[PDB]
Scaffold this active site. Sequence first.
Site, PDB file in Angstrom:
ATOM      1  N   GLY A  23       2.064  91.311   0.633  1.00 54.26           N
ATOM      2  CA  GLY A  23       0.713  91.041   0.191  1.00 54.26           C
ATOM      3  C   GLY A  23      -0.325  91.579   1.158  1.00 54.26           C
ATOM      4  O   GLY A  23      -0.020  92.249   2.149  1.00 54.26           O
ATOM      5  N   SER A  24      -1.587  91.265   0.857  1.00 54.79           N
ATOM      6  CA  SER A  24      -2.682  91.708   1.714  1.00 54.79           C
ATOM      7  C   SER A  24      -2.739  90.954   3.037  1.00 54.79           C
ATOM      8  O   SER A  24      -3.638  91.222   3.842  1.00 54.79           O
ATOM      9  CB  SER A  24      -4.018  91.591   0.972  1.00 54.79           C
ATOM     10  OG  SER A  24      -4.245  90.282   0.487  1.00 54.79           O
ATOM     11  N   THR A  25      -1.811  90.024   3.282  1.00 54.47           N
ATOM     12  CA  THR A  25      -1.641  89.472   4.620  1.00 54.47           C
ATOM     13  C   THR A  25      -1.197  90.539   5.611  1.00 54.47           C
ATOM     14  O   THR A  25      -1.409  90.387   6.819  1.00 54.47           O
ATOM     15  CB  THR A  25      -0.620  88.329   4.590  1.00 54.47           C
ATOM     16  OG1 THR A  25      -0.915  87.453   3.495  1.00 54.47           O
ATOM     17  CG2 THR A  25      -0.652  87.531   5.886  1.00 54.47           C
TER      18      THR A  25
END
Length: 637
Positions: free
Chosen positions: A383-385
């Site tokens: 994810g965008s983590t």
Amino acid sequence: TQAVEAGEKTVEQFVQALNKGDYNKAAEMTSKKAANKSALSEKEILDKYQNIYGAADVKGLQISNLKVDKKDDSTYSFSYKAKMNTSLGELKDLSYKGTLDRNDGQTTINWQPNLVFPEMEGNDKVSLTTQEAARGNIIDRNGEPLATTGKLKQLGVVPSKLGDGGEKTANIKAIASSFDLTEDAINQAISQSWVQPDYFVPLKIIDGATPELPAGATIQEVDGRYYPLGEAAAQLIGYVGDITAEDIDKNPELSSNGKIGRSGLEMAFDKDLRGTTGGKLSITDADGVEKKVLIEHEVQNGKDIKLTIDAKAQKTAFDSLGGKAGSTVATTPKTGDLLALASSPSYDPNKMTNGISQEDYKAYEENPEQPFISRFATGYAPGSTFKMITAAIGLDNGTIDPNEVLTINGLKWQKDSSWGSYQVTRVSDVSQVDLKTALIYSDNIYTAQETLKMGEKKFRTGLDKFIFGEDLDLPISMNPAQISNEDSFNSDILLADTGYGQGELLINPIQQAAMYSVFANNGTLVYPKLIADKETKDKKNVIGETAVQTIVPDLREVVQDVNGTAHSLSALGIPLAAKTGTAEIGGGGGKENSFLFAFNPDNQGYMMVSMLENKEDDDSATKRASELLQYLNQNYQ
């Protein structure tokens, strides 16, 4: 040497037939029943091998040091050492002897009872006594039990004391309403083929207080495997089941009456938990007096296994998911101690090991959310983590200037018109975005631009310093992480997508907690640890300490800034450095996965990585992390 080699082939085919379990094929290689030839007939040799080798679970007969010579004009002697595996261990150094018969044009074996076991003669019997070993326990980092053999309350019914006409129907409805059971399930249990009028028909296990027993109800105490946390640690611990006749064929050293781990740690650590079967395999005389003892050793119970899991953190991390599809990993990032490995939804392991119906088992397998999946060991797109890794790589190679401000207009962006209809999307329309702003607002367009500006070569150089492609030393079935399908992206779109962590990346939550641990050790990657006694293995200089001292202060703002994506966690009032993430993923709509990475930037006492697979609307991993972060901040400093 012509008949000697033909005799050596006859001995090898006879042993090979015994090793393969084909006793009829081995018995037909023997000579006729006589005094100077075979002792028994072919059908009697079959029954003797099938009864003796079948009782001791003999498997894996292999010989060595085979010597065949000549004794007479038609008699050839043979001898060899042999080894075999039984239900009590390995029979090593067995001196076998015998003679061959070269009548006609083929060579046979003058069969004698010494070919079963070395020192058997005439009508000697074989006796096998066995003692079952107690299965070892699985405990947490503080000794709390996670998998233990204990006493259970078996609630059953005797159909004789249940009634006749009318009184029998009233008592079935009375027990069904007193123990939360189905009225038709009690009738089906007492009407199975194995049931007799007075047989105690078991129903369910009572894991609490025993209510009043109506007519026909009775409780009996039986010992079995018990899991205290239940479904809260079902994917990690696993369950055990009854050992089948097919399991004994694979491993004779199992107990043909005990339990075997079917999944989770109960299976990965089955050998260390089941112990060794004790007893004695002896050769007795024609009556029942022992002659020689072949195998004998005391029973050894299974050794307990201590994990790094926290029993209270495992329950809290699981309950925080509220039964939705997701997972949570809590570690001590300085040592890698896995404090919690939660996966949701989950199944009941106690009901699994203590008799489960075909319908409840089919409900688990056909559940669309799949409770049998160990989601902490399943590869997902991070994810965008994943901005933290891309930014740290961008700071090490000097590509990203923390104070440089990119001008982004709108919510969509693409490099060229060659991208077609695809555009990198962001949620916040911030015009002036630098590194700190992109981490607060979770700006994927900033990360996509800095990744293309970094290039594939410089990006992979920083990524390769992690654990991509490595198999972790953990007793959990797991595939190594990958950057993409192949060693080259060969696509600017795929490169940008990999920048904010959703291209062909596959990193399971355990591998995520290892990669994200660099921000708690000044760029040193600490491998995760599940066994409490193992040493702490680490990987130094994964990212520069400059990037750590630049991103961690910004990760504090993801919680503290009023427009931060994790601002709801500032209610805790504890030192937090967090980063949220999303990943858009057979038909269906927008399968979005909400991520959350958070740790204590003051003491590095705990690290948390939670995710929600195929999230519901208005739901997020950040919304459900308030409870677990309090416990980790209180008990792990």
